[PDB]
Design an enzyme around this catalytic site. Structure first.
Site, short mmCIF file in Angstrom:
data_model
loop_
_atom_site.label_atom_id
_atom_site.label_comp_id
_atom_site.label_asym_id
_atom_site.label_seq_id
_atom_site.Cartn_x
_atom_site.Cartn_y
_atom_site.Cartn_z
N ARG A 252 0.82 -1.20 0.00
CA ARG A 252 0.00 0.00 0.00
C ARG A 252 0.86 1.26 0.00
O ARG A 252 1.69 1.45 0.89
CB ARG A 252 -0.92 0.00 1.22
CG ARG A 252 -2.03 -1.03 1.16
CD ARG A 252 -2.78 -1.13 2.48
NE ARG A 252 -1.91 -1.57 3.57
CZ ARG A 252 -2.32 -1.79 4.82
NH1 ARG A 252 -3.59 -1.60 5.14
NH2 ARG A 252 -1.45 -2.19 5.74
N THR A 390 -1.48 -4.44 16.22
CA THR A 390 -2.13 -3.15 15.91
C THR A 390 -1.07 -2.13 15.54
O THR A 390 -1.34 -1.17 14.82
CB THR A 390 -2.96 -2.58 17.09
OG1 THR A 390 -2.08 -2.22 18.17
CG2 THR A 390 -4.00 -3.59 17.59
N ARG A 429 -7.63 -2.57 18.16
CA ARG A 429 -7.77 -3.98 17.82
C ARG A 429 -9.22 -4.34 17.52
O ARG A 429 -9.51 -4.89 16.46
CB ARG A 429 -7.24 -4.88 18.96
CG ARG A 429 -7.40 -6.37 18.73
CD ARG A 429 -6.34 -6.93 17.77
NE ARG A 429 -6.71 -6.63 16.40
CZ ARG A 429 -5.86 -6.46 15.39
NH1 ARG A 429 -4.55 -6.57 15.57
NH2 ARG A 429 -6.35 -6.19 14.19
N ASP A 432 -10.83 -2.43 14.42
CA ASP A 432 -10.27 -2.99 13.20
C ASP A 432 -10.90 -4.37 12.90
O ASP A 432 -11.30 -4.66 11.77
CB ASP A 432 -8.75 -3.08 13.34
CG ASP A 432 -8.08 -3.72 12.14
OD1 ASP A 432 -8.69 -3.78 11.06
OD2 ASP A 432 -6.93 -4.16 12.29
N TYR A 515 -7.89 3.53 5.88
CA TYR A 515 -6.47 3.56 5.56
C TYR A 515 -6.22 2.79 4.26
O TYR A 515 -5.50 3.26 3.38
CB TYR A 515 -5.63 2.98 6.70
CG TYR A 515 -4.17 2.90 6.38
CD1 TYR A 515 -3.36 4.04 6.42
CD2 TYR A 515 -3.58 1.70 6.00
CE1 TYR A 515 -2.01 3.97 6.12
CE2 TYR A 515 -2.24 1.62 5.68
CZ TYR A 515 -1.46 2.76 5.75
OH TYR A 515 -0.12 2.68 5.44
O1 LIG Z 1 -5.51 -3.87 6.66
S1 LIG Z 1 -5.22 -4.33 8.06
O2 LIG Z 1 -3.95 -5.08 7.87
O3 LIG Z 1 -6.33 -5.25 8.60
C1 LIG Z 1 -4.99 -2.98 9.16
C2 LIG Z 1 -3.70 -2.18 8.86
O4 LIG Z 1 -4.11 -1.00 8.26
C3 LIG Z 1 -2.95 -1.86 10.19
N1 LIG Z 1 -1.63 -1.26 10.13
C4 LIG Z 1 -1.19 -0.97 8.80
C5 LIG Z 1 -0.07 0.03 8.73
O5 LIG Z 1 -0.34 1.20 9.53
C6 LIG Z 1 -0.53 0.84 10.88
C7 LIG Z 1 -1.67 -0.14 11.03
CA LIG Z 2 -6.43 -6.59 10.56
#
Ligand SMILES: O=S(=O)(O)C[C@@H](O)CN1CCOCC1
Ligand SMILES: [Ca+2]
Ligand SMILES: [Ca+2]
Length: 536
Positions: A252, A390, A429, A432, A515
């Protein structure tokens, strides 16, 4: 080795941030007028004979206008005075505001202040349903409770239902303020984001607005924005020169989004160096995450994980070429950190962030092992590994690197996983996992938090979703209590942790990953904060 299909959308930004040249003429003009407006505003705060309600509204306005960081001393002195005088004798609006402002600043004001507004049940008197400014402030206040504030249990539901009922007939901009609040409470918002909305959508449209304050707020916002744009350009140049965009195309490309995250942790000019260091870390561990998640083989990830633990350039040969790229960049980044901190004599403190990165990467590998074995751990075992993944223990530690007044004792406190950090990590956590459950269930992830929760307790997806929400609510009550004085470290080192929790709430609003998919959520924020200035 047949790698998985890359399916991340490109950066939506191109290079529009890569070069920004500040107009020094405008900057010096803004700063010079801000100096005058700052003094005027200080004198408003220090004015004698102000009524309680007037004083609280002034403080609230200055905070929402985003200019309170200029007046931390003045505002603390006033709230401390108000805290110690215990003149409990007001209406709902003033009481609710008093309670929120005091609690947000760590003053443990009793929640008994609300009892006069409730019947024998602890249920709010329904007679208050026609007091919109009271309802609004109760609403905002409802979000700062701790575990000792069960007297406020009903406040959120009560204020919400009547704010909704009243909203369509309210005048402007109050209607828009109520509607915005119902979607995003102030306490859990990203400060710059709420500030931008407040200045432009609300305060600027208020018939009663103070012109000195509005002016001050617009100039300050736009001047800081100039700094933020210089930082983002400097960070964009750094990222471009790494060229992960091309040499690591599976990952990404989200350095802008990472900058928005760092801006959420702190926006003030004095944290400029801290901000730049932090975003580099968020960006780089993002690369590592996608290496584990969406490219590397089991054998490759073992090697990568072990090389990280040993942390030594001699280990690169033991890695595939594409892993050598990120591995040297990681080791380089931390050497850069040490050098950048050398003149302050604070180089040694970089080891703390390094150990947290190692921890993250260990737990990435565990997560991969589980996935390959098709293992579904009990919730307790799941959590013991997935809290660190996380990255929030790591990002919190990293956030202190650039903070000039961070000391060894501060890192020592953080290393023990204090309760306020643990809470922020848990919020990240469980939010997400709630958002990404269905997506990762389709990718074959039998070890997702929600899946673990279902199998362990023997409950439906719905009930599992709810339990995780509960853990989030529990964690916010813990964050809130964690801010109350006396604090185990200075407040300056709690705020980034609080702000990390806010970033979660904001990034995953309405149950989607902003994100990974910045267009819906993050993009308007980034445009409002880093592209468009506030029209004066
Ligand atoms: O797509 S997941 O992998 O479920 C969540 C990620 O975005 C978590 N990380 C990625 C990089 O920045 C910090 C958090
Ligand atoms: Ca995840
Ligand atoms: Ca991941």
């Amino acid at each position: 080795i047949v790698r998985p299909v890359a399916d991340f959308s490109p950066s939506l930004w191109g290079d529009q941030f890569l070069s920004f040249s500040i107009k020094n003429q405008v900057a010096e003009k803004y700063a010079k007028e801000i100096e005058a407006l700052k003094e005027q505003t200080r004198n408003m705060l220090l004015a004698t004979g102000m009524k309680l309600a007037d004083t609280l509204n002034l403080i609230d306005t200055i905070e929402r206008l985003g200019i309170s960081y200029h007046f931390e001393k003045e505002i603390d002195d006033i709230l401390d005075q108000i805290y110690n005088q215990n003149s409990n004798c007001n209406d709902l609006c003033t009481s609710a505001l008093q309670f929120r402002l005091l609690r947000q600043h760590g003053f443990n004001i009793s929640p008994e202040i609300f009892s006069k507004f409730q019947d024998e049940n602890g249920k709010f008197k329904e007679s208050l349903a026609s007091d919109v400014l009271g309802l609004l402030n109760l609403y905002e206040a409802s979000h700062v409770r701790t575990h000792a504030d069960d007297i406020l249990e009903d406040a959120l539901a009560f204020s919400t239902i009547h704010l909704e009922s009243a909203a369509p007939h309210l005048k402007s901009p109050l209607r828009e303020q109520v509607t915005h609040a119902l979607e995003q409470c102030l306490h859990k918002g990203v400060p710059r984001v709420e500030t931008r909305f407040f200045i432009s959508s609300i305060y600027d449209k208020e018939q009663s607005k103070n012109n000195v304050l509005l002016r001050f707020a617009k100039l300050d916002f736009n001047l800081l924005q100039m700094l933020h744009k210089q930082e983002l350009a400097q960070v964009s140049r750094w990222w471009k020169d790494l060229d992960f965009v091309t040499t690591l195309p599976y990952a990404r490309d989200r350095v802008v989004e990472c900058y928005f995250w760092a801006l959420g942790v702190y926006f003030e000019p004095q944290y400029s160096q801290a901000r730049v260091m932090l975003v580099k870390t968020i960006s780089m561990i993002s690369i590592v995450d996608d290496t584990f998640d969406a490219y590397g083989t089991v054998k490759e990830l073992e090697a990568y994980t072990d090389a990280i633990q040993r942390w030594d350039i001699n280990e690169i040969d033991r890695l595939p070429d594409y892993m050598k790229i990120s591995y040297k960049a990681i080791l380089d980044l931390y050497k850069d950190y040490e050098k950048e901190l050398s003149s302050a004599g604070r180089s040694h403190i970089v080891c703390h962030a390094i150990e947290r990165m190692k921890e993250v990467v260990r737990n990435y590998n565990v997560e991969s092992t589980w996935f390959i074995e098709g293992y579904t751990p009990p919730v307790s075992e799941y959590l013991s590994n997935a809290l660190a993944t996380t990255t929030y223990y790591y990002l919190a530690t990293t956030s202190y690197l650039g903070m000039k007044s961070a000391t060894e004792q501060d890192f020592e406190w953080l290393s023990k996983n204090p309760k306020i950090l643990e809470a922020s990590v848990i919020i990240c956590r469980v939010i997400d996992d709630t958002a990404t459950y269905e997506v990762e269930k389709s990718r074959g992830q039998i070890a997702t938090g929600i899946e673990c929760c279902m199998r362990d307790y023997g409950i439906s997806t719905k009930e599992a979703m709810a339990k995780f929400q509960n853990m989030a609510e529990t964690a916010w009550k813990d964050i809130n209590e964690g801010l109350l004085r006396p604090t185990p470290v200075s407040t300056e080192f709690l705020t980034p942790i609080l702000n990390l929790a806010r970033i979660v709430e904001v990034t995953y609003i309405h149950n989607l990953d902003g994100y990974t998919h910045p267009e819906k959520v993050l993009k308007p924020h980034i445009i409002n904060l880093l592209v468009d200035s506030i029209k004066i």
